[PDB]
Design a protein around this nucleic acid. Structure first.
Lengths: 128, 143, 99, 60, 98, 110, 82
RNA sequence: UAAGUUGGGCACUCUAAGUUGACUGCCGGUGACAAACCGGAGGAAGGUGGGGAUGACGUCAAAUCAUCAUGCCCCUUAUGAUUUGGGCUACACACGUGCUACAAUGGACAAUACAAAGGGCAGCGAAACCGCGAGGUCAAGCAAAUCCCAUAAAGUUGUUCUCAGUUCGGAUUGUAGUCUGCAACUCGACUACAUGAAGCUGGAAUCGCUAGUAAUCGUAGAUCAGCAUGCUACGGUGAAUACGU
């Protein structure tokens, strides 16, 4: 056979997307997406890259992953997939970039500075 | 200036559930909000059992206004709503009245509210009324 | 059979060019040298206020930098020893010759 | 005043701990470090000196 | 107000005098959220009697000070300032048409 | 009364029924019920004569009594008898470790 | 607490050693913060230096809800009006 | 192999230094053609990408003689200096600031998934062992990409509680203990048992915040014998609003 592959990066959560022809199926960390990532019923959005690219599908999956929480970690999945789909076919880049998901979000957390405490609240002023 | 869209609902392929779980999403806890709302889609779709959208869409066309007001000396003007603000405020009094039943369950107060509101009753159909009694009472001196 | 080392200085240019000094003098009389295998090069933090008596909220920060370099070489012999203890300079590096 | 206290933190002790690690250059006891034994502010002055490496600055 | 005295010990005589005076402002309007008083002997060496006063107001506040020979002259001279610094404010007066 | 001591609630689970008596908390209840092999299950007093003997007697293993109020009284009475430098701070709002009274008006004072 | 266990400065106890065998005394002056009651000190008096001046405290029988380090707290009336 | 544990490979991620990159730069339009602005393409990033540092002349006779230094004055068997103890923390009260409760969006209990950063030399004390736990015994490893510190919480799965001043609540006081310290009474923290105050979202008035923000839940570090509802730093989760001036 053959298998495609890519890397994933957001929110302190890294994924090495390994994307292979197949049924369309996930075992992240040799473990399924669904029970692993709480809760979670959001994985349509994870398959929307298939809803727009080579739609319907399907290609099976593998990925090693660590760091951060489910939000970025489920969201670190896609850009390795969609990038592996550029590597599959750059034709759908016009179908991707018009819809995103190969643009890795450059945003992340901030730093602290004087003003912050336990809850991220800057201070009051002198009333009375 | 844009309003940071939510993509679809991943439950029944609507959208405004997503806009609505986030309004139940207090403390940034999504799963408990999603939990209790979809549970309410079990309860209301059970009692007088039916589709989600009958009670939902009807009720949120029984309370979801068309005219609001704003002040400006102080003269309160009746105004046409932008439909995002319309739907926005409908859901606002939806949850912000949902607690205000004063009951126990996660969902009965909700499903009571949308069931009642599909029937043009309760404080959300009410705030639509009173709001539209500030509209066309105050047409005169500020429109 | 191998040789290994650890380096620690607080300038990123001098330390690796110095690695090229000893490595050049090493594969001169040896070979089988591991390249400059980098290391995470962690840091520190030190926070002080811009004040003397009061005004705590308005402050300033400092740190420390800490470079590490992992370099090795295989099939040892006394020549690469003299290449080790031959040319470490500038001496901000903290060589730790080992095996 | 601090002039005899200079000897106090240098004098011997009955036992282990009724002591402190004040600053050397200054005599401010409080707001000191066990790394360099310097008050809050001499560190600032001699960090600007760049006497020790030292870094300083603003990469956090 | 932290009626504190730098190098002068606030007696009850001084507190009575002070608060007594600000009572007169109940003309407008009191409404008493807070009030402060800074008094000090700053040697020149003719050497003072400094008075600085602070009034927090409705949606705003008004500080007031002054120096003079002695405490009582300083409280009386600084008076008739934190009244006109207050009076007037409002009205303001209606529109639009159209 | 009912089973033991005084003031038992009716049709309430064991989980707190055994706790309204003056001296039981929550774990000690779990112990004493574990001794007669009894548990509620779930919100209610399901008790017949069967376990009644053991729940009436196994409760006797301690001074869950007004004698514990008596224990308090006689112990503080031992305190303020002597000189007593902590029966004085017993009235201020201060336990024997100190509590630095500025906003302690308060519930140990009025 | 203490590391198993009760203790004394080992001069005060060394003093009452000389006080306690014979016809006892009703008088001891001391400083006595690092020492506390136990049944050898019975039948005697003590006067711990509060911080300004010692004051008599006679060792009574069950002085066990109490110790040596303090008997009239040096906050001393009160510190407060009420 | 239980295990990247071993063989091997650095391919991948990772890792630290020089590279290329975004500069209205390319185009289209609007524009005194210029200045520019609006739009579009690509691009990872389009309009000083985001933040950090850097804070003009200067005002406040701002603050600090107690950082250090110092003009002047004053002292000098004391306005200096040594020791044991106290005190710097007392409370009818008030001001500010924070923390914790006023509950079923939940409390009690069982099983289970996920980080970042950073400390460590005689310090980090792995496993095992004792114990209701604080801790106590032992001792492998390790100046760290290693070993250890250290296990994340929120959450997910369930059970129960079923709206009480309640398993809310968690102050109060006592009892019995662990660590450190020569020493835990004025004046250390914590563990086990009990006891269960007020309090049902706060009145007038009043405060912050434009997106990974707020809000919330965790983590480490210094200060250190002992000790942070504080400070600094790290992440996890994570929205509503922005018309218009």
């Amino acid at each position: 056979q053959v298998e495609y592959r890519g890397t994933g990066r957001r929110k302190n959560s890294v994924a090495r997307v390994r994307l292979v022809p197949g049924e369309g199926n996930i075992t992240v960390n040799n473990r399924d997406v669904r029970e692993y990532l709480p809760f979670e019923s959001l994985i349509l959005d994870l398959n929307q890259p298939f809803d727009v690219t080579e739609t319907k599908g399907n290609y099976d999956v593998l990925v090693n992953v660590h760091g951060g929480g489910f939000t970025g970690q489920a969201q670190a999945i896609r850009h390795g997939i969609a990038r592996a789909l550029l590597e599959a076919d750059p034709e759908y880049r016009g179908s991707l970039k018009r819809a995103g998901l190969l643009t890795r979000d450059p945003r992340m957390k901030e730093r602290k500075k004087p003003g912050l405490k336990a809850a991220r609240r800057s201070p009051q002023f002198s009333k009375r | 200036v844009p309003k940071r869209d939510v993509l679809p609902d991943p439950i029944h392929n609507s959208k405004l559930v997503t806009k609505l779980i986030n309004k139940i999403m207090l403390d940034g806890k999504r799963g408990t909000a999603q939990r209790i709302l979809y549970s309410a889609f079990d309860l209301v779709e059970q009692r007088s059992g039916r589709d989600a959208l009958e009670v939902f869409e009807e009720a949120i066309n029984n309370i979801m206004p068309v005219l609001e007001v704003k002040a400006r000396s102080n003269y309160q003007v009746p105004v046409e709503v932008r439909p995002e603000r319309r739907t926005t405020l409908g859901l606002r009094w939806l949850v912000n009245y949902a607690r205000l039943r004063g009951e126990k369950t996660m969902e009965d107060r909700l499903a009571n509210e949308i069931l009642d509101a599909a029937n043009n009753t309760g404080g959300a159909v009410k705030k639509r009324e009173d709001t539209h009694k500030m509209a066309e009472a105050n047409k005169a001196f500020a429109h | 059979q191998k040789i290994r080392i650890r380096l620690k200085a607080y300038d990123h240019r001098v330390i690796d060019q110095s690695a090229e000094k000893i490595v050049e003098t090493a594969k001169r009389s040896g070979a089988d040298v591991s390249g400059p295998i980098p290391l995470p090069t962690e840091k520190s933090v030190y926070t002080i206020i811009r004040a003397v008596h009061m005004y705590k909220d308005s402050r300033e920060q400092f740190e420390q930098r800490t470079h590490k370099r992992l370099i090795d070489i295989v099939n040892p012999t006394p020549k690469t020893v003299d290449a080790l203890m031959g040319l470490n300079l500038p001496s901000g590096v903290d060589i730790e010759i080992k095996l | 005043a601090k002039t005899s206290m200079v000897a106090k933190q240098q004098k011997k002790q009955k036992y282990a701990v009724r002591e402190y690690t004040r600053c050397e250059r200054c005599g401010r006891p409080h707001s000191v470090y066990r790394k360099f034994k310097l008050c809050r502010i001499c560190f600032r002055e001699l960090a600007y000196k760049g006497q020790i490496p030292g870094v300083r600055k603003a990469s956090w | 107000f932290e009626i504190h005295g730098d190098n002068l010990t606030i007696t009850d005589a001084i507190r009575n005098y002070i608060e007594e005076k600000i009572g007169k402002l109940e003309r407008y309007f009191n409404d008493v959220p807070n009030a402060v008083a800074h008094v000090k002997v700053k040697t020149y060496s003719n050497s003072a009697t400094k008075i600085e006063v602070t009034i927090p107001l409705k949606n705003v506040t008004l500080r007031a000070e002054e120096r003079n020979d002695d405490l009582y002259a300083g409280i009386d001279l600084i008076n008739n300032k934190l009244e006109r610094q207050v009076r007037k404010y409002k009205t303001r007066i209606n529109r639009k048409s159209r | 009364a009912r089973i033991a001591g005084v003031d038992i609630p009716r049709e309430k689970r064991v989980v707190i029924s055994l706790t309204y008596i003056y001296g039981i908390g929550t774990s000690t209840a779990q112990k004493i019920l574990e001794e007669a092999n009894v548990s509620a299950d779930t919100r209610v007093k399901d008790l017949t004569d069967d376990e009644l003997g053991r729940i009436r007697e196994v409760v006797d293993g301690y001074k869950v009594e007004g004698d514990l109020r008596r224990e308090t009284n006689l112990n503080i009475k031992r305190l303020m008898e002597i000189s007593s430098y902590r029966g004085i701070r017993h009235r201020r709002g201060l336990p024997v470790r100190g509590q630095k009274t500025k906003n302690n008006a308060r519930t140990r004072k009025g | 607490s203490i590391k198993k266990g009760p203790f004394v400065d080992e001069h005060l106890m060394k003093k009452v050693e000389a006080q306690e065998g014979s016809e006892k005394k009703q008088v001891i002056k001391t400083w006595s913060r690092r020492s506390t009651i136990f049944p050898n000190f019975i039948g005697h008096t003590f006067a711990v230096y509060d911080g300004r001046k010692h004051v008599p405290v006679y060792v009574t029988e069950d002085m066990v809800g109490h110790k040596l380090g303090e008997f009239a707290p040096t906050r001393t009336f009160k510190g407060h009006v009420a």
